[PDB]
Amino acid sequence: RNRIPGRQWIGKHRRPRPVSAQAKQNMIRRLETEAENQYWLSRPFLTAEQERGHAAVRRAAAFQALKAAQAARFPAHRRLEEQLGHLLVTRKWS
Amino acid sequence: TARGTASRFLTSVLHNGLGRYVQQLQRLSFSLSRDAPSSRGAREFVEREVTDFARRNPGVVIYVNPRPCCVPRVVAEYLNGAVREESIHCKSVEEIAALVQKLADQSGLDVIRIRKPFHTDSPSIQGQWHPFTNKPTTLGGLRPREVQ
Amino acid sequence: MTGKELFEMWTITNPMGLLVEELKKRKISAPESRLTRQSGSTTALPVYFVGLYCD
Amino acid sequence: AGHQWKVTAEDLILIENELDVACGERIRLEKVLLVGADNFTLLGKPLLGKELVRVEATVIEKTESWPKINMKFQKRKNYQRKRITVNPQTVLRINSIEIAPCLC
Amino acid sequence: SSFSKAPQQWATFARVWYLLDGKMQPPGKLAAMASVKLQGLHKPVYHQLSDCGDHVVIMNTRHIAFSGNKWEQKVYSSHTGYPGGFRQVTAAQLHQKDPVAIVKLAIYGMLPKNLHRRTMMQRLHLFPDEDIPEDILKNLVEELPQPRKVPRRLDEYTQEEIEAFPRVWSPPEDYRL
RNA sequence: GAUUACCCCUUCUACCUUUUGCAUAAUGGUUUAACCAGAAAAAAUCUAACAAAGAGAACUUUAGCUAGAUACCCCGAAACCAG
RNA sequence: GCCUAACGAGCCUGGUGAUAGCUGGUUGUCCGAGAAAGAAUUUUAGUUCAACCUUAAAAAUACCCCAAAAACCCUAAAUUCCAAUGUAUUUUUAAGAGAUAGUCUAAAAAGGUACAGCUUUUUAGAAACGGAUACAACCUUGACUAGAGAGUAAAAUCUUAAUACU
RNA sequence: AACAAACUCCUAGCCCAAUACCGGACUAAUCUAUUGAAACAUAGAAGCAAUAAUGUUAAUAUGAGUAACAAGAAGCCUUUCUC
RNA sequence: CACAAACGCGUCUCAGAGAUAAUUAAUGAUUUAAUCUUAACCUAAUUAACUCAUAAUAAAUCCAGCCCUAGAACAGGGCACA
Ligand SMILES: Nc1nc2c(ncn2[C@@H]2O[C@H](COP(=O)(O)O)[C@@H](O)[C@H]2O)c(=O)[nH]1
Ligand SMILES: [Mg+2]
Ligand SMILES: [Mg+2]
Ligand SMILES: [Mg+2]
Ligand SMILES: [Mg+2]
Ligand SMILES: [Mg+2]
Ligand SMILES: [Mg+2]
Ligand SMILES: [Mg+2]
Ligand SMILES: [Mg+2]
Ligand SMILES: [Mg+2]
Ligand SMILES: [Mg+2]
Ligand SMILES: [Mg+2]
Ligand SMILES: [Mg+2]
Ligand SMILES: [Mg+2]
Ligand SMILES: [Mg+2]
Ligand SMILES: [Mg+2]
Ligand SMILES: [Mg+2]
Ligand SMILES: [Mg+2]
Ligand SMILES: [Mg+2]
Ligand SMILES: [Mg+2]
Ligand SMILES: [Mg+2]
Ligand SMILES: [Mg+2]
Ligand SMILES: [Mg+2]
Ligand SMILES: [Mg+2]
Ligand SMILES: [Mg+2]
Ligand SMILES: [Mg+2]
Ligand SMILES: [Mg+2]
Ligand SMILES: [Mg+2]
Ligand SMILES: [Mg+2]
Ligand SMILES: [Mg+2]
Ligand SMILES: [Mg+2]
Ligand SMILES: [Mg+2]
Ligand SMILES: [Mg+2]
Ligand SMILES: [Mg+2]
Ligand SMILES: [Mg+2]
Ligand SMILES: [Mg+2]
Ligand SMILES: [Mg+2]
Ligand SMILES: [Mg+2]
Ligand SMILES: [Mg+2]
Ligand SMILES: [Mg+2]
Ligand SMILES: [Mg+2]
Ligand SMILES: [Mg+2]
Ligand SMILES: [Mg+2]
Ligand SMILES: [Mg+2]
Ligand SMILES: [Mg+2]
Ligand SMILES: [Mg+2]
Ligand SMILES: [Mg+2]
Ligand SMILES: [Mg+2]
Ligand SMILES: [Mg+2]
Ligand SMILES: [Mg+2]
């Protein structure tokens, strides 16, 4: 008897839905975690210049491994045991 | 599906494992072809493994028949009377071995849905709840509006 | 015999009498049947709990 | 095996995964939360000392689960998948619950 | 613990008759516990496919109380199905007409909406005052505690309790009451 | 899903097609059986032969040549022309 | 109008398997990745190029990116560009198609009535088997299999209803 | 607080959803070559798999024992009556 | 009106009590005057609805046939006078 015009949640006229004490709690708890979050982000150990190149040795190494892993891709070895081993299909008792 | 098929409660045959454990698998019958390739694995299994298997399980009698068949089968048969058929057709030695083991360690009960994971006779030690168990008794044992 | 009762396999037909005899043997006297709990007497499905008392 | 059970002598449990034991082996189930008897009960925090209680179970039967169908479907996307699952199972008979007098 | 099988099973699933006094209670708080006991949700053995549910006898239904202005504002509506058969009736009017109605409707609204509602509605017995067939009296196991504590009027208090509570202010002798 | 138990309880808005979006009150089908719809090797890749050459003639070649294997549907107009 | 029950031009056979950018249909199982539109076009019911994407193959840097740096009157959210650092991606080569008829939500604007579940661009997002009773697009959530375990997420009735002035 | 998910732990694993297009691994049934000989194997081939085309043909239901259909009368049986 | 009927153009009958809305009053506090009062207590005067008195229905199982002011069928009323 009291219709919501058009589609429920979309248009110029929407279903009114209210904010719940639950929702306020949840949102606030998130906020608290974030405030703490940006407390711990506030004081670095090293300064900006103290970390320059501080590990550049590891980073280059990693990339050398990444490269090396790809360079190794080649068709696999083929062995006699395969092509010959196929004959085992017809093996018998006699 | 579960409404589709039959079902059973969890049980043992003859209360196995209570007094002592009895391996339920009774006999094992292989049928294979000396010639046919389909039976290849089954032949190798008979060569190497069967012998050792027979020592590892003294209580099961193993009948091996070479015959002209296209589809090697193994027929497990249990103390329960239960007969379970299998096809070893076109498998490794390894596969067959694993299969024969499954057969060795099964109860012979039918494989269907099992209604619940536990089976207890006398679950109830120290009582079984009834509507009165937690209710206080009154003086004279009168009902709510009863007068004396 | 696992899971089975006593009176499942014993089949004795008059429990009261047998009880009285066994209590004579134990030198205890007179079990008195005393009604303990009940729900609905007027129902087609009543439930009674009868207790037995000795002294 | 990741679950809790209410166990008593002579009984049966069905574990939903493989155990490495021969059929017939006796096994001490170690973690014990609760022990109980008609007149008393011991509670763990959250476990009972191995000296306080010992429950031994036999493995009766190694087996596999009945086939369980699993079917994904989507309306007018032409997508079905049907997969049959069979799970390895292990049936334990629990044998004895013994309880040692040492308690303080 | 040792019972034969049949009597054990019978004792466990046994029906029970609760008596619930209604005088000065909100039909809602009444219907809450009534609903629980009808569905047999107070039994640890509960399941939806077991018939378990117990009889509930509510009495003094006429003396039901309604918090706020609900007696005026709460309207029970129904429709005969015939054109112009739509009937709205204020709770005061409904109660005036049929003593049992209010509490019955509330309970019927709080049961689950399946077919079992119709069955477990048959285990509910409602009496406007305290007059109960002795048949129905003889089954009553126990009486549920009333869900609202009823405040006493001023004339209910003992003079001890009246002199025990402090005079808060001191009225002028000149002032007339 | 289950369940001692057929129902009763609980959970799920047929399927194709078409669409931004279909339980749709958009399309198609009473049902059963039998029939009823992806086809080609230029370049490519993969496997192999022989290799500054390869192909059982004719060609191609600054690692190529030769061979093999990998590929591209079904039903439907109103019409038009000749006899 | 009529010319053998349909004549804006008969019927039958052949041309004929006419031709349809248009509709319909298109048959075993399981696994790996996986796509919303810039350009032309008698073109917007379609094609062919880009950008993405797929299958192989070669490589080397790829995103992320602090200062420094990019306009003349006023001018925001912010871009561009780049070391470090966190990661494993990106670029070429060889083969390929599909797709190119788009929805809502938030944001900046335009048109309209500071109308539309309206229309036109730009940035972002989504298209749960959980929640918002029902629900495409809102919110929670790195979609495997079996358990008769466990912890969590989003989430369920919104407040007020007040005016004495001798 | 609790209760509440494809999230996350837990015990095991065969260890992570999908439309158009794309890649892969398997395979039903036929035939041929050799095996095989209570119904198969390794290859090679194909008219190689139908819950959807107002699909074709046959057969069956539903609507439905429904709509609709018919013979003037008696008698001694071909004689009288009535139209 | 050419069936014994059906029929109108003809004939007969048709209602009590309680409840309210708007709006009027009486008593009377917060605010010792006043004031109908989303102040109490009793209160009066007051539309239509709407409920309800009251009316109607109300004997479980003979039923072949045959009749009917009963009826599509099925049901239903008659069938001892005479
Ligand atoms: N052009 C285009 N169409 C898409 C894409 N993804 C989905 N679609 C279309 O969306 C429809 C259905 O979407 P879905 O069933 O995948 O949710 C189909 O018409 C399908 O072709 C895309 O990335 N590009
Ligand atoms: Mg709407
Ligand atoms: Mg709207
Ligand atoms: Mg449309
Ligand atoms: Mg599309
Ligand atoms: Mg929908
Ligand atoms: Mg519609
Ligand atoms: Mg319909
Ligand atoms: Mg539609
Ligand atoms: Mg239509
Ligand atoms: Mg339809
Ligand atoms: Mg259409
Ligand atoms: Mg269709
Ligand atoms: Mg149709
Ligand atoms: Mg070529
Ligand atoms: Mg292709
Ligand atoms: Mg022309
Ligand atoms: Mg033309
Ligand atoms: Mg003609
Ligand atoms: Mg064509
Ligand atoms: Mg076009
Ligand atoms: Mg269409
Ligand atoms: Mg997409
Ligand atoms: Mg042009
Ligand atoms: Mg392109
Ligand atoms: Mg910068
Ligand atoms: Mg850079
Ligand atoms: Mg287009
Ligand atoms: Mg729009
Ligand atoms: Mg966008
Ligand atoms: Mg939902
Ligand atoms: Mg996810
Ligand atoms: Mg995801
Ligand atoms: Mg949970
Ligand atoms: Mg996951
Ligand atoms: Mg995938
Ligand atoms: Mg073949
Ligand atoms: Mg075919
Ligand atoms: Mg067919
Ligand atoms: Mg038709
Ligand atoms: Mg068809
Ligand atoms: Mg018929
Ligand atoms: Mg007939
Ligand atoms: Mg009909
Ligand atoms: Mg007729
Ligand atoms: Mg005639
Ligand atoms: Mg006064
Ligand atoms: Mg006055
Ligand atoms: Mg009446
Ligand atoms: Mg009669």
Automatic annotation (TrEMBL), chain A:
GO terms for molecular function: structural constituent of ribosome. One of its GO terms (biological process) is translation. Pfam families: MRP-63 (PF14978). Mg(2+) 3 binds at P5, R7, H13. Mg(2+) 5 binds at R7. This is Mitochondrial ribosomal protein L57. The keyword Metal-binding applies. Signal peptide: none annotated. Mg(2+) 4 binds at G6. It comes from Sus scrofa.
TrEMBL record, chain B:
One of its GO terms (biological process) is mitochondrial translation. GO terms for cellular component: mitochondrial inner membrane; ribonucleoprotein complex; ribosome. Residues 122-148 are annotated as: Disordered. InterPro entries: Ribosomal_mL43 (IPR039927), Ribosomal_mL43/mS25/NADH_DH (IPR007741), Thioredoxin-like_sf (IPR036249). GO terms for molecular function: structural constituent of ribosome. It comes from the Eukaryota. Keywords: Mitochondrion, Ribonucleoprotein, Ribosomal protein, Transit peptide. SUPFAM superfamilies: Thioredoxin-like. Pfam families: L51_S25_CI-B8. It is found in: Mitochondrion. Belongs to the mitochondrion-specific ribosomal protein mL43 family. This is Large ribosomal subunit protein mL43. It comes from Sus scrofa (Pig).
Automatic annotation (TrEMBL), chain C:
It is found in: Mitochondrion. It comes from the Eukaryota. Component of the 39S subunit of mitochondrial ribosome. May have a function in the assembly/stability of nascent mitochondrial polypeptides exiting the ribosome. Belongs to the ribonuclease III family. Mitochondrion-specific ribosomal protein mL44 subfamily. This is Large ribosomal subunit protein mL44. The gene is MRPL44.
TrEMBL record, chain D:
Belongs to the bacterial ribosomal protein bL21 family. The lineage of its organism: Eukaryota, Metazoa, Chordata, Craniata, Vertebrata. The chain holds residues 106 to 209 of 209 of the full protein. This is Large ribosomal subunit protein bL21m. It comes from Sus scrofa. It comes from the Eukaryota.
